[PDB]
């Protein structure tokens, strides 16, 4: 199945010690807000670690799309999924 997270919980994950970001997945039925724990990705993210910290605890879908993240990047995302955010 799936694990749901509340925004009350997501919004706390704002430090480099435990960094979550949320990206809407328009390719999946229901367009879920997928929650990613990118803590262990900070050191290797090609965009750098600072930009991940900027959006920590928030939805970054628009910024993610504006970068034109590649198919390669999107494939690499799945390993960091922890669940989905509660719906709007
Ligand atoms: C798990 C989530 C993410 C993964 C796996 C990821 C992966 C990547 C990859 C592979 C690239 C190289 C370019 C490409 O292949 O398209 C990249 C570049 C970049 N990413 Fe991400 N990214 C993630 C989240 C984010 C988020 C949330 C932002 C916020 C905007 C971001 C900002 C950037 C920027 C700015 C670059 C390009 C840096 C430059 O070329 O100057 N990334 N990312
Ligand atoms: Cl996505």
Residue numbers in the entry: 12 to 99
Manuscript text:
The crystal structure was determined at a resolution of 1.4 Å by a single‐wavelength anomalous dispersion method using a heme iron atom (Fe‐SAD). The electron density map indicates that there are three different conformations of heme. Although the TS loop does not form any secondary structures, the residues on it form a hydrogen bond network with each other and a salt bridge between Asp36 and Arg45. The TS loop shows few interactions with surrounding residues outside the TS loop, implying that it can flexibly move independent of other parts of the protein. One interaction is a hydrogen bond formed by the carbonyl O atom of Ser42 and the side chain of Arg35. The second one is a guanidino group stacking between Arg45 and Arg92. 5, the surface surrounding the heme binding site and a cleft made by the TS loop are positively charged. 5 is thought to interact with proteins having negatively charged surfaces around their redox centers.
Tardigrades (also known as water bears), some of which are famous for desiccation resistance, have many proteins unique to them. 5, are distinguished from others by insertion of amino acid residues which we named tardigrade specific loop (TS loop).
